Every structure is written in structure tokens, then in C-alpha cells.
């Protein structure tokens, strides 16, 4: 009975759900790497990317400026979003934020966690997953097949 309802139910209601995401987003737009429960971090991820879309539009656009105010509680971050975050992402058209699952919380609450960040941040690189090198047994065999097929092609 909640089929196609993209949104979650968080906070004390619809408005509260909007105000909790405004705080994670402002922390993200400020620190560029923020932690939260997997559910809430994933809920924001859509909102996080769309700010860059408005930032790309530019300062002059009235709609971008107005939106950047409701979604940035601290008012020292609107200049940053437009003048450093937006220039960085001009080349890209998507994939602004990187989300990964940090182990469960060691709090006695034991909630699922995730770390969300902005790509190209100055902070130390996250321990991302690494796929096996082409030299590994299985990988090397496939490469031999590719060479054979490329010759056949």
C-alpha cells in the first residue's frame, strides 16, 4: 500500500522530515563528509545532489538563490556552494555524492550506519573497496580471451 511512494516517513511528520534533512544537508555542505543512520543518509542523498544542480544554475538565477536559502540553515555556506562546490562539479553531470556503509554503531543501539561525502573533498580518502588486479588468476584468463576475441573480431 506504499508502492511507488519514494519518500520515507521520518521525524514527527512531513514537515519534521524536511527539517531533519535540512540539518544533515547543511552539515554535509559544511563539512563535506557526514555520518548518519543508513536510512536517513540515503534519504538525503537525493536532496544533496539537487543542490549542486541549483548551484550550477548560478548566483544570478533568483530561483537558485531562494532555494539555496531554505536548504542551508547556516547562511555562511551559500557563498561556498555557489563558488567552490558548483565550479568543481561543472564537468560532471551526476554522481556528486559518495555513500558507503560504515559498520553498525557501537552504542547499544546497534543501528546501521553510512558515511556520505562530496567527491573531490580535501579530507583523507575513504577506504574504498578495491577490485582485484588484472594479474590475478581469474582476471588474467579473461584478458587472454579478450585478446583472442579481439584478433578474431
Amino acid at each position: 500500500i506504499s508502492h511507488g511512494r519514494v519518500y520515507r516517513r521520518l521525524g514527527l511528520g512531513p514537515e519534521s522530515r524536511i527539517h531533519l534533512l535540512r540539518n544533515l544537508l547543511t552539515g554535509l555542505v559544511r563539512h563535506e563528509r557526514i555520518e548518519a543512520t543508513w536510512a536517513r543518509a540515503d534519504e538525503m542523498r537525493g536532496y544533496a545532489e539537487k543542490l549542486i544542480d541549483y548551484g550550477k544554475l548560478g548566483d544570478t538565477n533568483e530561483r537558485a538563490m531562494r532555494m539555496a536559502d531554505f536548504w542551508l540553515t547556516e547562511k555562511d555556506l551559500i557563498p561556498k556552494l555557489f563558488k567552490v562546490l558548483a565550479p568543481r562539479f561543472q564537468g560532471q553531470n551526476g554522481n556528486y555524492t559518495r555513500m558507503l556503509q560504515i559498520p553498525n554503531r557501537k552504542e547499544q543501539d546497534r543501528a546501521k550506519m553510512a558515511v556520505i561525502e562530496y567527491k573531490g573533498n580535501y579530507l583523507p580518502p575513504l577506504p574504498l573497496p578495491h577490485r582485484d588486479s588484472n594479474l590475478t588468476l581469474l582476471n588474467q584468463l579473461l584478458l587472454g580471451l579478450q585478446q583472442d576475441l579481439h584478433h578474431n573480431q
Binding site: 548566483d59 544570478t60 538563490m65 536559502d69 540553515t73 547562511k75 555562511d76 551559500i78 557563498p79 555557489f82
Partner: protein
Amino acid sequence: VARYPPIVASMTADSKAARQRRVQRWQATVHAAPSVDEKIRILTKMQFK
């Protein structure tokens, strides 16, 4: 010509900066008070130890 919002603390937030801005609001009423007797009343209407 980007009409950025002023970089000031929030009025209703529970923070020291937000508290200080609310204090300035109270002092504003004193500044714009028309008469001296009203000025004194606003200053001392609240009693603390």
C-alpha cells in the same frame, strides 16, 4: 549582483550566537523607545536575584 542573505545567527536557535541576536532585539526596543520613563520600564521590568 547576488543578493546573498546576511551572514547572521538565527533568532530562534538554541545557541550562544542565536541567544546574543535575541538580546540585540530586546535592546532595539529600548533604543526606539519614545520617552525616558518607557526606557526605564523596559530595562527593569524583569527582576532577578
